[PDB]
C-alpha cells in the first residue's frame, strides 16, 4: 500500500503525524523533515567548517546525474573511478524495492582537483575540501567539489551523496537545494584494526568493510594478518610460513588477493597498512624452524596470555633473514602505505628463560635472568627486525609499537625514539602512561580498550562467563571517548584513534555487526572532536546505520525503529 503518515518538525523533532487529505500543506515524508529539522540533517560526520544546508529540497532525475573532472592528472584513474561509483552513492538514498519518479532537474557534478598527481598516503596528506549546490539555469543542479587532493576529493562526493534524500510518500527522489560546505579532519589516522589471524576473514568481507569504512571518511585499515594462532599472509620467499600455518589451503592472502584489497583501499582513500607481530604473537607456521620457543607450551598460564604460547628466538640469526623476507614480501603488495605496524605487545619473560639457548646467550653477554634482563633482549630484537624493516620498504618509515613493558614512558628512550616510532595505546584513557608518552613527545594512535576494543562483552572462549574486557562497548561510550580530552595540551601529537577488532570471537559472520555502526561512532569523533554528546549525535547516528544496512552491512540495530520515526519518545 502506501505510506499514511507525514512528519513535522517541532523543536529539532520531527514528529509523526497522519497525511489527512483535508489539508493545503504539503506532506514531508521522514527523512525530508530530518534533513533540515536536525542541525546537520543526514550528514554522517557533520562537517567542521561551514555547514550550510539552507531550506529548500529540490527533486531530481537519478538518470541526469553528470560527473565532470576539470583537472586532469596522475590521479585520473581514482578520479574516474570516484565519479563512476557516485551514482551507486546516490541510489543509497533510495530504500530496496522502491523506485524514483524519472523526473526533475539534472545534476551536474564538476570535481576540482587543485593537485591531481598526489596520490601517496601520509600523515601530512590534505583531506580538505569544499562542497558548493546550488540551481543552475531553470532546470539544473551545480554540485561543485573543490579539493587539495584526490583523498579530499572523494571525501566530498561521499558527503555529496548525504544530501539526496528519497521521499517515499511521492517516490521522488530529492537533493538540498543550497548548500555551502567546508570541511577537513581533526586527526588524519581514522582507523579500524582487523585481526585475520585468530579467525579468517573472507576478502569479499574486507572490500565490504571498506565499503563501510569510505562511507564514514574512515582512512585506514590495520591488517593483523599474523598471530600464534594462523599465518594466512602468502609470503612467497617463506613459503612453509603459509603452507604450515594457514587454518586451511583456502584460507589465505595470497599477493593478488592483497594486491586487489590494497588497490580497492586507494580509490576509497583507505590507507591499508600491514601488521606483523613480534616477537611474541608467533606460532602457527614457523615449525621445524627451531625460531621460535615455548609454541603450544603448557600449562599456557604459566607462559603467555591466551593459548597457544609461541614467541620469536631472538637469539637465532637466522630469524632475521626469515624477517628480512616477510618484510619484504610484505612491501611488496602493501605497496600504499607510508607506516609499518610491528606489534611488540605482551612479550613473556617466562617463555623466554624457559630457553636453554636464551639462557646461555644472556650469559654470554653478561646479562642476568631476572626481568629487566629480558628488556635488553626484547631491545635486542627490535633493533635488528627495525632494521630489516627499513631494508624491506627500502627507506626508513615510521614504526608503530603497542603500548607495553617496553614502551613505558619512563625507559622507553633508552630503546626507541619519537621520530621512528609512533605508539598505539590500549590502556585505559586515564592510565598515567598516556600522559608520560606525550610529555617525551611520542605520538599515539588512541585505541582504549574501555572505550575501542569491539571484541568486549561477549561469552568467554576459554571458560565460562564473559570474555575479559566485558562490557560490551555501546556507541555512545565510543562516541565520548575523546583524544582532545584524553591528551589536552599534547592533543596535535595524537595522530587520531583506531577501533580494534581482536578475533577470538568473530570472523566473516560477525565482522558487519562487530564493526558497524559502533565504528561510525569513532569516525565522527575522529573527523570533528565534537563539543557535543552522543545525545546531540544520537538521530543522526540512527540514520547512517540504516543507510549501512542499505549498503548491504549487517549491521547492528542501536534502537526499535518505532524510536528513528518518532524522536524524543525513547529517552532516559
Ligand atoms: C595489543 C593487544 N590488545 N589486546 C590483547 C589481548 N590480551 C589481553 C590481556 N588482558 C587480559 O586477559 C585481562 C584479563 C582480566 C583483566 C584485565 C585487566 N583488568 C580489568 C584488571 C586489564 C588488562 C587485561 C586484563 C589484559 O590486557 S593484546
Ligand atoms: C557552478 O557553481 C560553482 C560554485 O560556485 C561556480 O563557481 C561555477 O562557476 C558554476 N559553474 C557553472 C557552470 O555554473
Ligand atoms: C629464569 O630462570 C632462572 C632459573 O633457571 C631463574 O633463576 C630466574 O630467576 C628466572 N628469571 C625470571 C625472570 O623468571
Not at 339 to 364: K, L, P, R, T, Y
Request: aromatic share 12%; proline share 5%; hydrophobic share 35%.
Amino acid at each position: 500500500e502506501d505510506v499514511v503518515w507525514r512528519w513535522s518538525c517541532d523543536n529539532g523533532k520531527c514528529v509523526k503525524l497522519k497525511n489527512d487529505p483535508r489539508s493545503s500543506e504539503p506532506a514531508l515524508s521522514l527523512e525530508a523533515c530530518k534533513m533540515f529539522c536536525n542541525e546537520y540533517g543526514l550528514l554522517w560526520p557533520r562537517p567542521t567548517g561551514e555547514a550550510d544546508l539552507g531550506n529548500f529540497l529540490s527533486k531530481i532525475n537519478l538518470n541526469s546525474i553528470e560527473v565532470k573532472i576539470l583537472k586532469k592528472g596522475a590521479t585520473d584513474d581514482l578520479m574516474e573511478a570516484a565519479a563512476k561509483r557516485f551514482k551507486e552513492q546516490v541510489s543509497l538514498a533510495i530504500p530496496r524495492g522502491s523506485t524514483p519518479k524519472l523526473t526533475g532537474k539534472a545534476v551536474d557534478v564538476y570535481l576540482v582537483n587543485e593537485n591531481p598527481n598526489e596520490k601517496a598516503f601520509s600523515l601530512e596528506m590534505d583531506e580538505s575540501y569544499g562542497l558548493r549546490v546550488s540551481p543552475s539555469g531553470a532546470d539544473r543542479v551545480n554540485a561543485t567539489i573543490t579539493a587539495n587532493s584526490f583523498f579530499g576529493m572523494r571525501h566530498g562526493l561521499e558527503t555529496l551523496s548525504q544530501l539526496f534524500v528519497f521521499d517515499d510518500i511521492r517516490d521522488h527522489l530529492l537533493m538540498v537545494r543550497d548548500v555551502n560546505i567546508s570541511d577537513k579532519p581533526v586527526y588524519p589516522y581514522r582507523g579500524i584494526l582487523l585481526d585475520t589471524a585468530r579467525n579468517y576473514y573472507s576478502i569479499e568481507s574486507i572490500k565490504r568493510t571498506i565499503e563501510a569504512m569510505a562511507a564514514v571518511k574512515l582512512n585506514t585499515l590495520h591488517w593483523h594478518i599474523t598471530d600464534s594462532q594462523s599465518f594466512p599472509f602468502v609470503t612467497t620467499k617463506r613459503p612453509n610460513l603459509y603452507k604450515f600455518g594457514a587454518l586451511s589451503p583456502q584460507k589465505v592472502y595470497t599477493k593478488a588477493a592483497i594486491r586487489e584489497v590494497v588497490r580497492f583501499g586507494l580509490e576509497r582513500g583507505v590507507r591499508v597498512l600491514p601488521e606483523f607481530d613480534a616477537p611474541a604473537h608467533v606460532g602457527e607456521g614457523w615449525q621445524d624452524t627451531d625460531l621460535t620457543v615455548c609454541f603450544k607450551a603448557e600449562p599456557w598460564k604459566s607462559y603467555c596470555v591466551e593459548p597457544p604460547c609461541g614467541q620469536l628466538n631472538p637469539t637465532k640469526d637466522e630469524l632475521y633473514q626469515y624477517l628480512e623476507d616477510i618484510y619484504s614480501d610484505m612491501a611488496e603488495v602493501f605497496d600504499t602505505t607510508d607506516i609499518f605496524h610491528m606489534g611488540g605487545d605482551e612479550v613473556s619473560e617466562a617463555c623466554w628463560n624457559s630457553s636453554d639457548s636464551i639462557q646461555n646467550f644472556m650469559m654470554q653477554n653478561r646479562w642476568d635472568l631476572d626481568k629487566e634482563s629480558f628488556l635488553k633482549l626484547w631491545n635486542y630484537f627490535q633493533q635488528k627486525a627495525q632494521d630489516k624493516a627499513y631494508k624491506a620498504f627500502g627507506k626508513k618509515l615510521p614504526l608503530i609499537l603497542w603500548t607495553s613493558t617496553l614502551t613505558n614512558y619512563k625507559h622507553i628512550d633508552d630503546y626507541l625514539n619519537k621520530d621512528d616510532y609512533i605508539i598505539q595505546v590500549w590502556t585505559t584513557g586515564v592510565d598515567p602512561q598516556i600522559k608520560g608518552l606525550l610529555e617525551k613527545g611520542y605520538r599515539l594512535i588512541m585505541s582504549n580498550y574501555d572505550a575501542l576494543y569491539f571484541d568486549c562483552g561477549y561469552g568467554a572462549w576459554v571458560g565460562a562467563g564473559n570474555n575479559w574486557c566485558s562490557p560490551y562497548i555501546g556507541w555512545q561510550k565510543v562516541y565520548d571517548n575523546s583524544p582532545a580530552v584524553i591528551a589536552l595540551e599534547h592533543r596535535d601529537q595524537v595522530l587520531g584513534g583506531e577501533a580494534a577488532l581482536w578475533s577470538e570471537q568473530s570472523d566473516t559472520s560477525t565482522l558487519d555487526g562487530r564493526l558497524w555502526p559502533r565504528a561510525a561512532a569513532l569516525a565522527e569523533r575522529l573527523w570533528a572532536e565534537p563539543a557535543t554528546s552522543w545525545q546531540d549525535a544520537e538521530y543522526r547516528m540512527l540514520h547512517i546505520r540504516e543507510r549501512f544496512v542499505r549498503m548491504g552491512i549487517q549491521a547492528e540495530s542501536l534502537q526499535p525503529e518505532w524510536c528513528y520515526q518518532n524522536e524524543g519518545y525513547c529517552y532516559s
